[PDB]
Design a protein around this ligand. Structure first.
Ligand code: IMP
Ligand code: IMP
Ligand code: IMP
Ligand code: IMP
Ligand code: K
Ligand code: K
Ligand code: K
Ligand code: K
Lengths: 350, 350, 350, 350
């Protein structure tokens, strides 16, 4: 077997050391724009998010309302694919034709929306999603280092060329990144075992500390860019517990962040608002739980504290990210990724 | 004294990083067959388990019923030797003559069964076990790095040559492995202080994290194979807390796994089913406890939650191992041992 | 991004290993004098504290009474700047004209006092503080690695040359130290995220273990001294939980220590003494809490156990520091910084 | 300041890896004899303990009864010196003239006894202790790296030459060992901050993990032996929590072990047996507590569970040490120190 020289680490084991803050760096001047799909050196991505946040491909998170609320703030949602093809396509259609400053829209001013797909019924699901107006797709899986994903992306390329965008994953190392890169993925998702609803050491024992995963994948992505001239955006998926973890994820190189629990707490999540013993909560369950996979166990069902509407919470979260970015001397995500000083902290200090 | 460069680690400190999963790797096609006794390069072992699990040499685990239930699923039990020679032999006889898809049997279609022996009364115990039809023997001890085990194996070779198989142990490093290898052991057991009923730092303070122990012994076993052409199967004994620890143990190189607590929870364990305050439990005590050694203290007595019949639980456990194996791109244990990517995780992440 | 080879550590992760204690080293002969502002090689600082302790630039700590009580024992207070310019100047005036063995005074025998300033209204605040008789100033900020601090210090130099002393900070590495050094700071404060009222991983996630921060800054300060002949005193700000942390901070190279919580517990702190359920406590809130910044959240409000008058507590604390210094063979802070043997301890031992 | 490459570790962070156990190694044949005072290469120590245990120089541990009970089993007690010279000498006299298989006695068959001394009144205390019949003395201090100890040992040599034996300490590194060695100490005690009644990080913050301390001192002692031909026995003082820590301490190189809490639990300790809420306990306080030093605070007062008479407990403890020694292939302490395989374990495994 193959072993590693260092153990993996989570976001909580890191802190950012401030850099030179110049007079021009104030929150309001920080640009959080970021690329969603791959492009060549010298080019710009065909799709750029206004904010680096995307909602998870989960039944309990990304419904039509979430997609609209998030797109309005500049991010994008990936309508869950764990439902009928007709049902998912309807949600995409609804978002695209809802209108019939930081909003994320297409050339027709329609909100952008993404849709998750699987490696099984894609031949019938993809065409339906495309027809419905899906702007981007993403294969939804915990282990994306699979020949099945290569096959799915291949079918999409043969049928649509580079006209249809498709993200792939999840993977946690350079090899996994490289495989999906050569297979043609437009963006690659990072993360196995870091999700809030994931108790890896109770499931199959696969995974890697999210921080180490991102750092390793990002290094491979940059090496890949230098060899081929192709820049593939990467997504840090799961493990975001505090707002500063967002800044860390981006600083380590992730172009954008996928969150489930964070967004489930909002009014716009498709789940029921349940007042439990004085405290308002919201339902939240993983895609691996029986409560969802049937559309030993493989998931968990829980509650998250109600946080109100998405808007106010995202604004608050991003204000802190912008502020921290200025402490690090960065006005943009690329500048933060270049200038960030990231230190590991001792277990005792935690 | 001699010191080491790195501290030892337990199975809980590791996770498997996925490799390339091909279209042909699905649970039902995974082969969990594995060698039980030594053979030369180019050969196959005279005894191959259908599943890599064996029940512990304990009064509270491996009785006649356990041996039959486990052999039916492809594994093998080691009837405890902490009882009279006549009593142990009777259990072996019963298993061998019980019949008078994955079942483990001999050329006469009789279930395979093993028997534990000690370094004291083996001159009278071994012949009785052989006559009773024991398929394999195993010296039962916490510290197998002993001249006593060399003597016992030697007596067996002089009297039966290589016709009678005998495992030895336990040891935790290359030196211990090497000593029992040269002494003639057919398989070597790994593990001191990792058992669930073992509070080393309350006993004699001897031991080593199970993971480090396996990794070190496996490296020595492979070095030994390359020097002599002799492949000696090794057994990871104790410390299995979760199903994924099984996959880890195998991935690190262990050919099979010995479990006590895991099997004690089943209907077939020779202990009493005790309903305690609404919850059904089963008795479980170590071979070092006074409740067993008399056939300061040196053991513990406890209860384990009832899990029902062995069959359903083993099937469930092995389905997860097979699934994880496919995530790692492996259709067989040898392929998993060759391709596994194993990472240590930080203490904080735990 | 830039990463580090070692994780950062807090004061609690260190212990001092005794050195040779000579017959002349007894507590009463230990000299705790220390420089407050920069000087050139061969010179002495224009301002030397009698004891290496200074009270924090906080509304809940450094008021007029604190400043007088601390100056009487040899230390100095930095009147908080989070109040009106007129209000802060009045406190400075009161301390300077209060008299109208270890006391810290000027050539006119008036108690020394410091005053915090900000990077915004300094053009009006500084002149008022100077006129009021402030002996030293200090820019109050969590992230001193800012062009804003360079601008503030520059304005002070152009208007007063080196006649007005101004400390800057906070920073946590050599780069941050170097920037404020070249900018002209008279002393530099070390520390981000180590304060007792700081939950970094709930704010912006910036910071560094206080110990590592001091050690790193001190190395840069000594390198700087060797290149330019300029010795800049550094202050370890925050994170002092036990008296021995004081000895550690000094041993690692800090010239003096800034404390908030430690001093808040005293009768002289400007807060209310609140008897809560039998125990007398004192109010303590951070400068980032809403309860103070308005003169999502950015601070905490709490209570600290009443410790009585400053005098008896400081004497007790410093007696232990002096005693420990003799164990390390040191009669002065510079000798301790030169001879200290500092070891990291394992997480398990904690 | 000076820093170290590795953090210090306690005994709990180590485990012994078994070595080859030969047929002749059984508990009853294990020899636990060990040297108490220094000798030259090729020689034997003038005083050899039958068992490597000595009771602490504490009012709550080593009284006349303890000294007799321990000497009867082969160890020796150091009558506490924190009492009047007349009072301490009386206890020594009583032990020496109490008679007016493993017993530790002199050529006149009188029990051996030790006595603690301080660096202040030794000119009057030593002669009184010698006259009373003290077999060995030991300077009692937490920081033995002192010119005061050099002075005390020097006075003893000038007045008695090498006729009076005197141990010194405590120290925790090679430098401290070396200083007391050159000063003439007959044995050196190791340990600062490891005692059970020591909360270092609440006192002065001085110390070092006991394990690292012993390992480091032992290396220096062996280097010293090779340079000068003088072998100085070293004592691991404090930190023994479990019986196996004894085996560890010896394996790491300590010739003998000093224990306080361990012996306080016995009927023979000079403290009161207090039945508290059904459980019989014994008083135990440190020499630094006010309850003893007057013959801020510097010690703790507590209770230890009653263990009965010393004899049965020591026999039990040493049987486990002997058994563990055989697992390591050692029949004597020197052989264990030479053959022991010692591994550090991960924090997670603890
Ligand atoms: O049932 C599940 N088990 C484990 N991970 C899951 C499950 N469902 C979703 N996830 C992952 O967890 C992410 C959400 O992480 P969270 O933001 O920490 O809640 C998703 O985007 C998925 O990648
Ligand atoms: O009394 C005992 N003390 C320590 N280890 C024991 C004892 N009895 C059995 N064992 C070991 O523990 C293993 C079982 O580990 P478990 O599966 O974690 O319960 C056995 O196969 C033995 O090697
Ligand atoms: O609101 C706050 N948040 C974080 N740090 C603060 C705040 N107010 C003051 N500080 C810092 O904490 C120090 C006090 O640390 P303490 O002595 O551990 O209580 C101050 O000198 C500041 O540098
Ligand atoms: O008051 C005290 N504070 C700290 N250490 C002490 C005190 N009194 C005795 N000791 C040390 O603690 C040892 C006992 O350690 P114990 O066996 O762990 O209880 C003694 O031999 C001394 O070296
Ligand atoms: K900055
Ligand atoms: K895979
Ligand atoms: K000293
Ligand atoms: K052995």
């Amino acid at each position: 077997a193959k072993y590693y020289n260092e153990p993996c680490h989570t976001f909580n084991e890191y802190l950012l050391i401030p850099g030179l803050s110049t007079v021009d760096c104030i929150p309001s001047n920080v640009n959080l724009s970021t690329p969603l799909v791959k492009f060549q050196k010298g080019q710009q991505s065909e799709i750029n998010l206004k904010i680096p946040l995307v909602s998870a491909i989960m039944q309990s998170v990304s419904g039509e309302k979430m997609a609209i609320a998030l797109a309005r703030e500049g991010g994008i949602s990936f309508i869950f694919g764990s439902q009928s093809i007709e049902s998912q396509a309807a949600m995409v259609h609804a978002v695209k034709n809802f209108k019939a400053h930081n909003e994320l829209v297409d050339s027709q001013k329609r909100y952008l929306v993404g849709a998750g797909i699987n490696t099984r019924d894609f031949r019938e699901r993809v065409p339906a999603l495309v027809e419905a107006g899906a702007d981007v797709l993403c294969i939804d899986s915990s282990d994306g280092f699979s020949e099945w994903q290569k096959i799915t992306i291949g079918w999409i390329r043969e049928k649509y060329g580079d006209k249809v965008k498709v993200g792939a994953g999840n993977i946690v190392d350079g090899e996994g990144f490289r495989y999906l890169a050569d297979a043609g993925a437009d963006f690659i998702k990072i993360g196995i075992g870091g999700g809030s609803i994931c108790i890896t050491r109770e499931q199959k024992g696969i995974g890697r500390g999210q921080a180490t995963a991102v750092i390793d994948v990002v290094a491979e992505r940059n090496k890949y860019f230098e060899e081929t001239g192709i820049y593939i955006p990467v997504c840090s998926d799961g493990g975001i517990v505090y707002d500063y973890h967002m800044t860390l994820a981006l600083a380590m190189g992730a172009d954008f962040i996928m969150l489930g629990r964070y967004f489930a707490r909002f009014e716009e999540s498709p789940t029921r608002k349940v007042t439990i013993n004085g405290s308002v909560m919201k339902e939240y369950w993983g895609e691996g739980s029986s409560r969802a996979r049937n559309w030993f166990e493989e998931g968990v069902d829980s509650y998250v504290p109600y946080a109100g509407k998405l808007k106010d919470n995202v604004e608050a979260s991003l204000n802190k990210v912008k502020s921290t970015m200025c402490n690090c001397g960065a006005l943009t995500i690329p500048q933060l990724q270049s200038k960030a000083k990231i230190t590991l902290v001792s277990s005792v200090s935690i």
